[PDB]
Design an enzyme around this catalytic site. Sequence first.
Site, PDB file in Angstrom:
ATOM      1  N   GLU A  27      -7.409   9.516 -95.195  1.00  0.00           N
ATOM      2  CA  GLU A  27      -7.471   9.109 -93.791  1.00  0.00           C
ATOM      3  C   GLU A  27      -6.074   8.852 -93.235  1.00  0.00           C
ATOM      4  OE1 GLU A  27     -10.052   8.906 -91.599  1.00  0.00           O
ATOM      5  OE2 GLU A  27     -11.135   9.975 -93.173  1.00  0.00           O
ATOM      6  N   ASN A  31      -3.629  11.183 -90.145  1.00  0.00           N
ATOM      7  CA  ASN A  31      -2.852  10.678 -89.032  1.00  0.00           C
ATOM      8  C   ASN A  31      -1.405  11.130 -89.163  1.00  0.00           C
ATOM      9  OD1 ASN A  31      -2.293   9.160 -86.640  1.00  0.00           O
ATOM     10  ND2 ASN A  31      -3.955   7.817 -87.239  1.00  0.00           N
ATOM     11  N   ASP A  58       5.918  10.246 -92.055  1.00  0.00           N
ATOM     12  CA  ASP A  58       6.166  11.504 -91.364  1.00  0.00           C
ATOM     13  C   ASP A  58       7.457  11.395 -90.577  1.00  0.00           C
ATOM     14  OD1 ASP A  58       5.646  11.270 -88.146  1.00  0.00           O
ATOM     15  OD2 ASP A  58       4.273   9.969 -89.238  1.00  0.00           O
ATOM     16  N   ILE A  79      -4.796   0.990 -82.401  1.00  0.00           N
ATOM     17  CA  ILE A  79      -5.237   2.021 -83.345  1.00  0.00           C
ATOM     18  C   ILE A  79      -5.601   1.400 -84.691  1.00  0.00           C
ATOM     19  CG2 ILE A  79      -4.529   4.153 -84.550  1.00  0.00           C
ATOM     20  CD1 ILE A  79      -2.707   4.728 -82.171  1.00  0.00           C
ATOM     21  N   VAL A  82      -9.127  -1.332 -83.866  1.00  0.00           N
ATOM     22  CA  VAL A  82     -10.287  -0.978 -83.053  1.00  0.00           C
ATOM     23  C   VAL A  82     -10.935   0.254 -83.671  1.00  0.00           C
ATOM     24  CG1 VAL A  82     -11.138  -0.342 -80.763  1.00  0.00           C
ATOM     25  CG2 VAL A  82      -9.196  -1.921 -80.994  1.00  0.00           C
ATOM     26  N   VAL A  84     -12.648   8.800 -89.866  1.00  0.00           N
ATOM     27  CA  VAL A  84     -13.021   7.444 -89.474  1.00  0.00           C
ATOM     28  C   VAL A  84     -11.791   6.683 -88.976  1.00  0.00           C
ATOM     29  CG1 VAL A  84     -14.967   7.440 -91.036  1.00  0.00           C
ATOM     30  CG2 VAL A  84     -12.745   6.563 -91.818  1.00  0.00           C
ATOM     31  N   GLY A  85     -10.614   7.111 -89.416  1.00  0.00           N
ATOM     32  CA  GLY A  85      -9.367   6.641 -88.850  1.00  0.00           C
ATOM     33  C   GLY A  85      -8.751   5.506 -89.646  1.00  0.00           C
ATOM     34  N   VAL A  86      -7.486   5.228 -89.316  1.00  0.00           N
ATOM     35  CA  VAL A  86      -6.711   4.278 -90.099  1.00  0.00           C
ATOM     36  C   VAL A  86      -7.176   2.842 -89.910  1.00  0.00           C
ATOM     37  CG1 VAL A  86      -4.668   5.742 -90.192  1.00  0.00           C
ATOM     38  CG2 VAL A  86      -4.955   4.113 -88.301  1.00  0.00           C
ATOM     39  N   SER A  87      -7.961   2.529 -88.867  1.00  0.00           N
ATOM     40  CA  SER A  87      -8.463   1.157 -88.751  1.00  0.00           C
ATOM     41  C   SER A  87      -9.377   0.805 -89.920  1.00  0.00           C
ATOM     42  CB  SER A  87      -9.186   0.938 -87.412  1.00  0.00           C
ATOM     43  OG  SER A  87     -10.323   1.765 -87.282  1.00  0.00           O
TER      44      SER A  87
HETATM   45  O1  LIG Z   1       2.933   8.913 -91.227  1.00  0.00           O
HETATM   46  C1  LIG Z   1       1.898   8.268 -90.612  1.00  0.00           C
HETATM   47  C2  LIG Z   1       1.110   7.372 -91.323  1.00  0.00           C
HETATM   48  C3  LIG Z   1       0.089   6.686 -90.684  1.00  0.00           C
HETATM   49  C4  LIG Z   1      -0.135   6.885 -89.334  1.00  0.00           C
HETATM   50  O2  LIG Z   1      -1.091   6.237 -88.548  1.00  0.00           O
HETATM   51  C5  LIG Z   1      -0.724   5.092 -87.828  1.00  0.00           C
HETATM   52  C6  LIG Z   1      -1.613   4.517 -86.935  1.00  0.00           C
HETATM   53  C7  LIG Z   1      -1.229   3.395 -86.221  1.00  0.00           C
HETATM   54  C8  LIG Z   1       0.012   2.833 -86.419  1.00  0.00           C
HETATM   55  C9  LIG Z   1       0.875   3.383 -87.343  1.00  0.00           C
HETATM   56  C10 LIG Z   1       0.516   4.520 -88.050  1.00  0.00           C
HETATM   57  C11 LIG Z   1       0.645   7.785 -88.625  1.00  0.00           C
HETATM   58  C12 LIG Z   1       1.657   8.477 -89.263  1.00  0.00           C
END
Ligand SMILES: Oc1ccc(Oc2ccccc2)cc1
Length: 184
Positions: A27, A31, A58, A79, A82, A84-87
Site C-alpha cells: 500500500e 503511493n 520517492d 491522507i 481519513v 485501501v491507502g496509507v491511512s
Molecule cells: O514515497 C512515498 C511514500 C509514501 C507516500 O504516501 C504518503 C501519504 C501521505 C503523506 C506522506 C506520504 C508517498 C510517497
Amino acid sequence: LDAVRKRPGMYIGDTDDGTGLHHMVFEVVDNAIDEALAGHCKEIIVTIHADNSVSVQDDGRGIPTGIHPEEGVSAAEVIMTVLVGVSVVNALSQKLELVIQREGKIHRQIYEHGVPQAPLAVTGETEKTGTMVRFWPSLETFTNVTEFEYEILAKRLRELSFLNSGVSIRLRDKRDGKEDHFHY
Ligand SMILES: Oc1ccc(Oc2ccccc2)cc1
Ligand SMILES: Nc1nc2ccccc2[nH]1
C-alpha cells in the site's frame, strides 16, 4: 480510523499468516509509485531495516503540505488519518514517521497507532524534493508472521516494474545485505 482498528483483516488482509503484513508495504509502494511518476527521475527505494520496519521513498515532487481548507490540518495528515491507502497502514503501525521535501523545506511528522504526535512541521531547508515513509507494523495486530520476507516483497516489486515502465525500483535488505534493482 477506528473502523480499521476494529477489524484490521477486513482492510489489510490476514494478520496472522503474513498476508496483511506484506500488504502494508504494497500500500505504501502504491503511493510512492504515484509520486515518482509525477517527477523527473522516477525512482523509489524500498528498505527492510534491521528492526523489521520498512521505509519507502520517492524522488517526486513531495506530498502537499498546506492546510486542508475543510479538515483544518495539513493535506498530508488528511491522507494519513481519513479513510485501501496509507491511512490503513498508519492505523496499523505502532509507529510511522514521514518526511516531505517540497518548496525548499523539509517537513516531518510522527504517528503512533495512527495518532499524530504533533502537526506536520518544517524542520529545515532543502533543494531536493520527494517523500519518505518508515513504518513499524503494530505487534498488537500482526501475529505469528512478524518479520518481513525478502522474496515476497521482491516478487511484487518485480511485477510492478513491468507495469510501471520507466520507474526504477530498488529493494534493499539491511538484515543480510541483499539487494535488487527492478527497472524495465
Ligand atoms: O514515497 C512515498 C511514500 C509514501 C507516500 O504516501 C504518503 C501519504 C501521505 C503523506 C506522506 C506520504 C508517498 C510517497
Ligand atoms: N498501544 C496502543 N495501541 C493503540 C491503539 C489505538 C490507539 C492507541 C494505541 N496505543
